[PDB]
């Protein structure tokens, strides 16, 4: 549970510095390769653990004909996960597509939350 | 740890019995209870052995008996309530050489003789340890080594200094079938003897591990293929993506 | 039966993931394929990549790790050595 | 594309020479299994009853 | 509906091993609990049929097992089953506990699930400790020994603690005797704590080596699953033929074949494999009380993993980095053994020392950095700004 | 295994509970036939019947 | 929703404890199952406690007891509770079992609620049994006899299991070590037993003493019967304290102050009371494989009871000709327990036949009889024609 809003944070900041972002990125990079994952048709927004309110409220919120698509690449990895195999090559997700199509709304809904929880606890000085 | 304390690594040796298909060679157990029997007996209980269990492995049903009648055991009280002995029966266990703990290390210089029922199970090695100990005291403690008063020295004990003086010189036990009674043949048999003592079980426990594996390999592999077959349809199964109208 | 506490899993026809449209299965029956439905041929070129792909993961820390063994194993078989009861007298008080 | 186009399972299928071989080789692999198993579990069972049969240090027939 | 789901009894049967809809992607690592279920019930099945003839009186105790051994028809295959099964029972554990690891089971909603595992795998080592004491040979006086000692570090009472625990002077008769109950008490704790641990795994369900949603493509435990969980079983039980027939000892110390004698420890004192990476962590601290704290915080720091990882998905599956160290943290805790086995000797020690750390630090520090890294390698990654 | 070999037998079904128990009942003593005799033949002058032959008292 | 609802574990202990809607008229009959759990809990525990100071060793057996009771700290008070209670643990059973015939809760759809109760009952026999073979003294060795003989009744093989069961000659050392062994695990299953016990009991809920449907007036578990049960608890208790501490072998027969001899049987062979109506059963049948079956009979015959009912209501309550034979069967079943303590003498054994008919007839035939009849009354006892 490191906040999404809190991973915004860091990885803003490394990506406007131009300074980090030439550093950090080529590895980033480098990194979203090793993964194997989008050899399992898989974007990254589906690999995000879900069994949390937050992502209840960010799924519920997802477009319809966009959950369709998760829906079939996620069925598509166990498919083939359990054909303890890679997709033929051209399936693979390819580096433009890899696009974080969820994370408006887990930020959308974490920005929501901690605004409730302030509001909860709001304090007062007479 | 010098290589002193820890005593040389016995060598491996090639026993009779060394293999998963292996029975012991009872001819050679047979002759080491002779060579148990003229030898350490002197010193040594075989306590957890009970003279039945010789018969059919070593021995024939009277030459038990026979060795079994030699000693006394104790026998419940006549009509007076006054004790008394009796020979043994094939259901005892081979005596000590001595009545208590105390007695054993009166003839010992205070040593404590390992009763070797157990022997070749309660040591690393077992089996070239055991040979090994036995044909293994050189003739002068090494150069520097200095030994204490009824002390001897071995490499492979730790450290040497085994209260166990030299038992095994050549031809002391007259080897009733007629084979060379060496000190390195004298020694292969005890242990083989001794072997059997602390596993009885032997030659039926890797019969049986025979069967069991031989069984159980094959429900492997069947089962294995039967896997295969009942998760054909999963293993085959085949998707496919049709994007659809959006109206909902 | 009294409320049960939400989780994540249900039963079939409940079983709580998202509303599934588009995808079309097909499959054959397990009588209706060769017994050996693909062994040993092309089946293997996998049992090296199915490697590859991870060794090493494991090789890498083994090594590591290995090695980091040995090395000390050796230097305690010296330091107990007749050539090493020097650098022990020191090393040890 | 259409549904109805079906996928190619050309490569698991077997050629017609019998559609029986995927059955036939099935059940003795099952039936061996079977076999074995219940020859084993038979022994298992056999091994523990026979646990209490009379010790081996005990049958003073005297 | 049918008869397995109406009936009160063959219900549960079927919710938990007919009709249980697994995810479609689960592997051969998910077959451990099967296989833990098995040992458990070996352990059980042997243990009381040995028991019959087992005798719990320090005099007779270790004779009693030799007569097992000896003279009770079978019983050498009902010893060395006991025995090498304990072993297989402790590997295989270890397995699922690692699976469990790797593909970071530990992680919510399955925290309690993890949590009772760490109380069976409490209740096991105590367990199978007290089987152990019951042989009473060397390694069984001795080992029996010092862990009754381990409530000494109890501050004041500690002592009494001890004494009390011996029922005397020394480990002595009134101990081994307690240690035979307690052994017969205990595997059933653990059974009935395999149930919450099973209920806890129902509620959820398994997870999948992908570390996403099983919800999309479930398919039922019968027959797949009990089909696969066979090959497995089967698997297990030839091993441990191989050990129980050819092997019987290659598992187990020497030393215990010699009767238990309270004036003389011996001196080659290596204690259980499964074991071992504890009796070094123990050893690695020149301190009395805060040694025990830190052998008994060696499994308790494991209920932290579910706040420490900070990741953002279940899986090292598609964590290299993740990968990498969790396999730094399997083979340090092999070495760790390696060390509980050599002697108290350099660089030994000194090695030993740097593991324990390598070990905690691990829980607490690597998997907590290295996860909140990843979770930054995952977003500039990709996206443009 | 043959198509031909099994169907003769069986058909077209597998084997049935109490066939499988007779062939277990059966392969039990066919076994342990075997496999005794293959041990006691390659450890064959060793077993105390081959030695029990040659000693005599 | 709450969280004792929520959660895995404590939800179970809500809705079989705090939450359950119990009928709203149920009386103090009810609070049997309820201290029938208690007696299971009392014999585990004092059980385990006392076996860590005892030895099945067929010498030290006896004397080992006569340890727990000479040595022990408050070991005394561990036997004469274990055993008085273990008798109390049968008074409540029957008593549990009576009130399940009276209001006739035997009827569906608690059939197999019902059904296991026989198991369990079964089991409870099974046990205490054994647990009297594990004093070793005179009603034990002999008692230890008779059961293991009652095998032989079975055609050809009977014999041989019971020189099986035996592991030799006679009722031997293999014998009172597997007997302890058998004790020990029995308890467990029943246990387990219990719960599927109170899972039957879950799912359609108690009855009441009026026979009528319960969902129309229910209230929860907590706090009435919590605090109604514990009134039959505290009580239970006391003349459990005043057996255990004032009268401690009102209940047990001096015999067994004795060393077991295998060679001399004793002259006054009363069993244990609970046992004593099937003793009497046993006797009354002048023929061996029979008189076995017809003890066995005795308790299985149970099982019928649910058609042999014919009624068209559940309970005696309002059931004149029903109550009367009702207290026909319990009076009957206490006589043939007084001719179990009389010696095979006249006009006992005579007695005993015929209450032993009575009994079978209870069950078989007065019954199905009387409620038919008692259907009939019901009918023409109002209507016009
Ligand atoms: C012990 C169970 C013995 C018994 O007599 O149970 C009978 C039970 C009756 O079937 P049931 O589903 O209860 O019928 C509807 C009535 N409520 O039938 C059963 O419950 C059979 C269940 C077999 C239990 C196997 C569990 C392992
Ligand atoms: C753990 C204990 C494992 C030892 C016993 C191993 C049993 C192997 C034999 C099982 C044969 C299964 C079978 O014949 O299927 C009938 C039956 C259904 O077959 P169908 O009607 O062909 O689907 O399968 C079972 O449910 C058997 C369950 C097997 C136990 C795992
Ligand atoms: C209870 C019945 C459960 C069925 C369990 C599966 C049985 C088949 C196992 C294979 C055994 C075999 O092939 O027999 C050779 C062999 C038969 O010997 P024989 O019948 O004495 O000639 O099996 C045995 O000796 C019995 C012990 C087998 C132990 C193998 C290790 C597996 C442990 C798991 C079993 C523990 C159960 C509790
Ligand atoms: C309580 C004490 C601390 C925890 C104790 C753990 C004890 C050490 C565990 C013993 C070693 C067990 C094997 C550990 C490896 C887990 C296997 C695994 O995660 O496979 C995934 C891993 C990759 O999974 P994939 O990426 O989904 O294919 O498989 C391997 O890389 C090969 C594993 C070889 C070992
Ligand atoms: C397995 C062997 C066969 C069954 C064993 C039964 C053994 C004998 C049972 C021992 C005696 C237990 C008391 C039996 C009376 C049941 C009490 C009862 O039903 O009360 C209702 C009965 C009338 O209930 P009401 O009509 O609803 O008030 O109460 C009485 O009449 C007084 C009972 C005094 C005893
Ligand atoms: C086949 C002949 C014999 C064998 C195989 C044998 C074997 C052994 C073994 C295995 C030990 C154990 C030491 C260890 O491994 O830690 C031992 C010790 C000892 N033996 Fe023997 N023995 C034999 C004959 C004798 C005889 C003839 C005597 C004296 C008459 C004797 C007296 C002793 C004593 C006093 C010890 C105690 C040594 C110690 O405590 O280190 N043994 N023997
Ligand atoms: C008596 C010992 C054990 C038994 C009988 C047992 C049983 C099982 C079974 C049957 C499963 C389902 C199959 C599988 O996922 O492997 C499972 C999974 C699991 N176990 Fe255990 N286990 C035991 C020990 C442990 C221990 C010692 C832990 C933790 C310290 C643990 C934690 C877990 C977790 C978190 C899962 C879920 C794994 C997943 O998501 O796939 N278990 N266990
Ligand atoms: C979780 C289950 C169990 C574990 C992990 C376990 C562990 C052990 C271990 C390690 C030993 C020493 C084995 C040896 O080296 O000889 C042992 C011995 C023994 N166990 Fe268990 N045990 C378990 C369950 C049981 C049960 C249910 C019984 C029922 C009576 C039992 C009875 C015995 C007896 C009589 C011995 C002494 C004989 C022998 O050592 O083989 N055990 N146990
Ligand atoms: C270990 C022994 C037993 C335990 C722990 C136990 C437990 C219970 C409990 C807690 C109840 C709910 C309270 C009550 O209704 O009394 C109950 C009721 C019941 N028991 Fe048992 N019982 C045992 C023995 C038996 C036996 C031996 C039988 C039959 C042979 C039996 C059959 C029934 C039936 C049919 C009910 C439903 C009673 C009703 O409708 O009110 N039980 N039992
Ligand atoms: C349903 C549960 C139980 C019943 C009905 C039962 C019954 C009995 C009975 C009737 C006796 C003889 C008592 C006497 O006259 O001295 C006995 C003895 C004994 N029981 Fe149990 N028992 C049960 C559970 C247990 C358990 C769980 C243990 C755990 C070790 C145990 C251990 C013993 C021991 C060591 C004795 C001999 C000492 C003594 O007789 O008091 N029992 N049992
Ligand atoms: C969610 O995913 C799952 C999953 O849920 C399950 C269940 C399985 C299958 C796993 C199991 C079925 C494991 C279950 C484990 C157990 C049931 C262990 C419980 C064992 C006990 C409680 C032991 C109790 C044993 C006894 C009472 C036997 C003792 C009786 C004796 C000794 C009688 C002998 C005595 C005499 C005198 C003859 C999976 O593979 C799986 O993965 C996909
Ligand atoms: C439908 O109507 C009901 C109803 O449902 C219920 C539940 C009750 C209440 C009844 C109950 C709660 C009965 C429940 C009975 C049980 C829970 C019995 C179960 C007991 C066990 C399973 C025993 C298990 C015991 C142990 C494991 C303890 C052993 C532990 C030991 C010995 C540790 C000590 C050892 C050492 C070394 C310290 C009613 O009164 C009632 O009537 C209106
Ligand atoms: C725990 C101890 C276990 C001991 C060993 C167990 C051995 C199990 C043997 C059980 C054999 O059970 C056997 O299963 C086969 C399926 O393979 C059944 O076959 C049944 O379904 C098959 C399809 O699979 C059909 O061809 C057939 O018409 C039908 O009868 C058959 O009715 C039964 O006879
Ligand atoms: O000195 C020890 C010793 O320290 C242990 C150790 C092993 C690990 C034990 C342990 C206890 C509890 C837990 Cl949760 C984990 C490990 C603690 C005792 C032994 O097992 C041992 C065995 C035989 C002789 C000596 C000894
Ligand atoms: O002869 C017997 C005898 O027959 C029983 C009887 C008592 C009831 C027993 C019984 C066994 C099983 C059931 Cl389901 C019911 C009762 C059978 C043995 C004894 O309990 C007994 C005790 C002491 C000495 C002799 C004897």
């Known amino acids: 549970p490191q906040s999404f809003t809190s991973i915004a944070r860091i990885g803003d900041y490394i990506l406007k510095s131009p300074v980090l972002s030439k550093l950090c990125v080529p590895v980033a990079n480098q990194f979203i390769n090793l993964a194997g994952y989008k050899k399992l048709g898989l974007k990254f927004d589906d690999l995000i653990a879900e069994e949390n309110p937050i992502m209840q409220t960010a799924l519920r919120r997802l477009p319809e004909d966009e959950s369709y698509a998760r829906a079939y690449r996620i069925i598509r990895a166990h498919q083939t996960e359990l054909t303890h195999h890679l997709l033929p090559r051209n399936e693979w997700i390819k580096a433009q597509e890899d696009v974080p199509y969820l994370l408006p709304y887990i930020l959308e809904a974490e920005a929501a939350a901690k605004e409730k929880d302030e509001l909860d606890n709001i304090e007062v000085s007479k | ?248 | 039966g009294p409320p049960s506490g939400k989780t994540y899993m249900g039963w079939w026809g409940h079983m709580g993931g998202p509303k599934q449209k588009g995808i079309t299965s097909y499959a054959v029956s397990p009588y209706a394929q060769k017994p050996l439905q693909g062994i040993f041929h092309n089946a293997v070129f996998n049992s090296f990549r199915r490697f590859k792909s991870q060794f090493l993961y494991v090789l890498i820390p083994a090594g590591i790790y290995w090695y980091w063994w040995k090395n000390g194993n050796e230097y305690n078989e010296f330091l107990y050595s007749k050539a090493g009861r020097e650098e022990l007298e020191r090393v040890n008080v | 594309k259409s549904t109805y186009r079906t996928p190619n399972f050309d490569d698991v299928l077997k050629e017609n020479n019998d559609a029986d071989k995927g059955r036939s080789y099935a059940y003795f692999m099952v039936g061996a299994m079977g076999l074995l198993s219940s020859a084993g579990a038979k022994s298992t069972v056999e091994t523990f009853i026979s646990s209490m049969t009379a010790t081996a240090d005990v049958l003073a027939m005297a | 509906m049918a008869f397995r789901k109406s009936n009160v009894y063959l219900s549960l049967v079927n919710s938990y091993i007919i009709d249980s809809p697994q995810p479609s992607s689960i592997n051969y690592w998910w077959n451990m609990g099967s296989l833990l279920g098995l040992c458990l019930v070996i352990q059980i099945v042997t243990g009381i049929f040995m028991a019959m003839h087992y005798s719990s009186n320090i005099e007779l105790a270790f004779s009693s097992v030799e007569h097992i051994m000896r003279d009770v028809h079978n019983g050498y295959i009902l010893r060395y089953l006991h025995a090498n099964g304990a072993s297989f029972f402790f590997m295989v554990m270890f397995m699922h506990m690692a699976k469990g690891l790797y593909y970071g089971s530990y992680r919510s909603p399955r925290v309690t699930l993890w949590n009772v595992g760490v109380i069976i795998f409490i209740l096991t080592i105590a367990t199978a400790f007290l089987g152990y004491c019951c042989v009473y040979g060397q390694m069984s006086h001795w080992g029996a020994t010092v862990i009754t000692n381990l409530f000494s570090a109890i501050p004041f009472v500690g002592n009494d603690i001890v004494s009390w625990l011996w029922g005397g002077f020394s480990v002595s008769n009134p101990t081994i005797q307690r240690f035979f109950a307690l052994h017969y008490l205990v595997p059933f704790i653990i059974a009935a704590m395999v149930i919450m641990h099973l209920m806890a795994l129902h509620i959820h369900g398994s997870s999948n080596p992908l570390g996403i949603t099983g919800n999309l493509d479930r398919i039922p435990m019968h027959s797949y699953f009990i089909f696969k969980d066979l090959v497995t079983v089967f698997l297990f039980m030839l091993i441990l033929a191989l050990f129980v027939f050819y092997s019987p000892n290659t598992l187990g110390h020497p030393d215990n074949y010699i009767p238990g004698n309270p004036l003389v420890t011996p001196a080659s004192i290596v204690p259980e494999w499964y074991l071992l990476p504890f009796y070094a962590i123990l050893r690695s601290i020149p301190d009395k009380l805060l040694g025990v704290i830190t052998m008994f915080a060696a499994i308790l720091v494991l209920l932290v993993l579910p706040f420490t990882d900070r990741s953002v998905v279940r899986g090292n599956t598609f964590k290299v980095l993740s990968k990498f160290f969790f396999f730094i943290f399997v083979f340090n805790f092999v070495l760790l053994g390696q060390i509980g086995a050599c002697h108290v000797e350099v660089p030994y020690v000194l090695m030993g020392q740097i593991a324990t750390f390598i070990y905690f630090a691990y829980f607490l520090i690597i998997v907590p950095v290295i996860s909140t890294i990843e979770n930054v390698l995952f977003y500039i990654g990709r996206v443009n700004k | 295994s043959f198509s031909s070999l099994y169907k003769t037998f069986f058909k077209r079904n597998a084997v049935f509970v109490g066939t499988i128990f007779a062939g277990a009942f059966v392969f039990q003593t066919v076994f342990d036939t075997a496999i005794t005799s293959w041990y006691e033949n390659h450890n064959k002058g060793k077993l105390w019947k081959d030695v029990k032959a040659r000693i005599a008292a």
């Open chain 2, 1 to 248: 740890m010098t290589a002193a304390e820890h005593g040389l690594h016995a060598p491996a040796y090639a026993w009779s019995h060394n293999g998963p298909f292996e029975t012991f060679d009872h001819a050679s157990i047979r002759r080491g209870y002779q060579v148990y029997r003229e030898v350490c007996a002197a010193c040594h209980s075989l306590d957890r052995v009970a003279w039945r269990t010789l018969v059919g492995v070593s021995h024939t049903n009277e030459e038990v008996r026979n060795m079994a009648e030699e000693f006394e055991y104790d026998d419940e009280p006549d009509e007076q309530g006054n004790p008394k002995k009796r020979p043994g029966k094939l259901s005892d266990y081979i005596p000590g050489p001595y009545p208590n703990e105390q007695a054993a290390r009166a003839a010992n210089q205070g040593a404590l003789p390992p009763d070797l029922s157990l022997i070749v199970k309660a040591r690393h090695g077992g089996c070239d340890y055991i040979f090994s100990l036995l044909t293994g005291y050189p003739d002068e403690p090494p150069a520097g080594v200095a030994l204490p008063p009824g002390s001897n020295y071995n490499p492979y004990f730790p450290g040497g200094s085994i209260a166990m003086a030299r038992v095994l010189f050549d031809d002391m036990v007259e080897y009733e079938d007629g084979t060379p009674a060496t000190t390195s043949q004298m020694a292969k048999d005890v242990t083989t003897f001794l072997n059997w003592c602390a596993e009885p079980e032997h030659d039926e426990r890797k019969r049986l591990g025979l069967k069991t594996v031989i069984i159980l390999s094959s429900l492997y592999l069947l089962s294995i293929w039967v896997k295969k077959f009942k998760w054909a349809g999963i293993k085959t199964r085949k998707f496919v993506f049709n994007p659809p109208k959006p109206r909902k």
